């Protein structure tokens, strides 16, 4: 695994020893090459895992997340090139350093054979994101947003640490392989109930769970474009990955303890999809859509059936790509209009036709149009839920209908109708933005050809 970690570390001295006007080119080229190298982790086994060493191991759940993490950095650099133009070389190098450190921590987090090492890196990712949000955000609310994004996380994560060390004091190890092979049932006890809660709540808060989702709209709205991209694409999936790893020690207590979270997610997906219908801000609408999709992923993980896990993996990958694309489109509009109010700039199809095509395809993938991987994950989760209980179909279908409604509402409001007359600074789309949009969308339509790459270890 060092053949990916070491180049990502070398990205830092290369960035800091670069010319003042070569940082973006060098960073983009070498991050793309690192993505290409990481692409060879996809050759997974039907047996246990790719156990590289005592410290790092790869799995067909970890490999798609690793590849998406490596692929996201070049897109983040391309998106950040525009709004950082008027800023000094040292500060741009610091921004690229924060992005590189975030990638390094995420890469080490997804392999992380140890649960304490996983926790340490899973919490180390917090610092670069907070600095990016509270340093290079625009509005005055960013500081407040950062505070939320901080404390919520720690409010969930501090009990987990205690639980973790407690387990190693009883089991003797926190290695995931030993934990899986030596797993034992949890008796229905108050102590075991609180151990279950301490294990679950940390990952629940970062999905986020419906009741615990307040930090996400603030953090995603006030963050710069690279921050929003990394928050929606990779950082939300840490909770799902952690739950998928940790639910192996929580059986059979998950059967009883899953009910409040299942109800919260099943009702909150409807609530947040309905919230999307009445939203005056593009970024907030995209954030609430992310909350709905992650609610579906929470349901899938809580059901803990093979089809549930496959659907959850597919949906995590598809949502990451789609939400990053949607945020990039919103930012392309914002850098022209500087308002971030959906109703202000209207009828952009007549002025930006190719960008309108990008908007249409992004809305189509968000709408879960078959045979996209978005719908593959959606349908697998829905079928698993139907087997779990036939009444889930009402909530699932209502969520599908509202999702289509708000996706097409977002498309029609911004692209169709009549152009706003007083806005005359809508310049033609740059090659950088179109390239960014294509680099988001072609991986999705190309992954629909080989779904088993993103269906997880239970395929």
């Amino acid at each position: 695994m060092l053949k990916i970690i070491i180049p990502t570390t070398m990205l830092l001295p290369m960035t800091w020893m670069s010319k003042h006007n070569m940082i973006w080119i060098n960073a983009t080229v070498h991050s793309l090459l690192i993505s290409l190298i990481s692409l060879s982790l996809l050759n997974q086994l039907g047996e246990n895992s790719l156990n590289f060493s005592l410290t790092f191991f790869s799995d067909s759940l970890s490999a798609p997340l690793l590849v998406l993490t490596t692929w996201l950095l070049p897109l983040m650099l391309m998106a950040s090139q525009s709004h950082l133009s008027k800023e000094t070389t040292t500060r741009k190098k610091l921004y690229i350093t924060m992005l590189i450190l975030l990638q390094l921590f995420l890469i080490m987090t997804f392999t992380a054979t140890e649960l304490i090492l996983f926790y340490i890196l899973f919490e180390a990712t917090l610092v670069p994101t907070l600095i990016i949000i509270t340093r290079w955000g625009n509005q005055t609310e960013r500081l407040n947003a950062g505070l939320y994004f901080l404390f919520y996380t720690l409010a969930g994560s501090l009990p987990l640490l205690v639980a973790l060390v407690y387990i190693q004091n009883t089991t003797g190890s926190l290695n995931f392989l030993i934990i899986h092979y030596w797993s034992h049932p949890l008796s229905n006890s108050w102590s075991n109930i609180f151990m279950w809660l301490a294990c679950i709540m940390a990952f629940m808060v970062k999905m986020p769970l419906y009741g615990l989702h307040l930090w996400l709209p603030k953090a995603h709205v006030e963050a710069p474009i690279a921050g929003s991209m990394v928050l929606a694409a990779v950082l939300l999936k840490l909770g799902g990955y952690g739950m998928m790893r940790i639910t192996t020690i929580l059986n059979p207590l998950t059967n009883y303890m899953a009910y409040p979270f299942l109800m919260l997610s099943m009702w909150g997906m409807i609530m947040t999809s309905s919230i999307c219908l009445r939203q005056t801000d593009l970024k907030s609408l995209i954030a609430y859509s992310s909350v709905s999709h992650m609610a579906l992923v929470i349901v899938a993980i809580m059901i803990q059936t093979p089809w549930s896990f496959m659907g959850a993996t597919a949906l995590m990958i598809a949502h990451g790509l789609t939400s990053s694309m949607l945020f990039c489109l919103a930012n392309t509009n914002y850098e022209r209009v500087h308002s971030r109010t959906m109703i202000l700039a209207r009828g952009l199809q007549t002025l930006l036709p190719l960008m309108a095509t990008w908007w249409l395809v992004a809305s189509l993938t968000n709408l879960a149009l078959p045979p996209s991987i978005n719908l593959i994950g959606e349908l697998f989760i829905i079928t698993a839920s139907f087997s779990w209980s036939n009444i889930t179909i009402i909530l699932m279908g209502m969520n599908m209908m509202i999702t289509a409604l708000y996706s097409l509402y977002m498309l029609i409001t911004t692209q169709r109708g009549k152009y706003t007359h007083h806005i005359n600074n809508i310049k033609p789309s740059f090659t950088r933005e179109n390239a960014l949009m294509a680099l988001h969308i072609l991986p999705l339509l190309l992954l629909t050809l080989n779904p088993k790459m993103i269906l997880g270890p239970l395929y």
């Binding site: 036709p353 190719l354 033609p428 789309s429 740059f430 090659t431 179109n434 390239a435």
Partner: protein
Amino acid sequence: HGKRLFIIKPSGFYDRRFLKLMRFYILLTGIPVAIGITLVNVFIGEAELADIPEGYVPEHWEYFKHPISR
């Protein structure tokens, strides 16, 4: 009838330029790949399943059929 009028419309130059660039680069790498793939299939062919001879242990890459996979 010489009543031809000017059609006010946004610039299509940049969209066409981006599409041409993307097509050129994708083809620049994909055409050699397609030609090579076809050539490999046509002349190299594919491995045929056979029983392992006694006293012979195959290499790990000899358990696969397609030459590119091998």
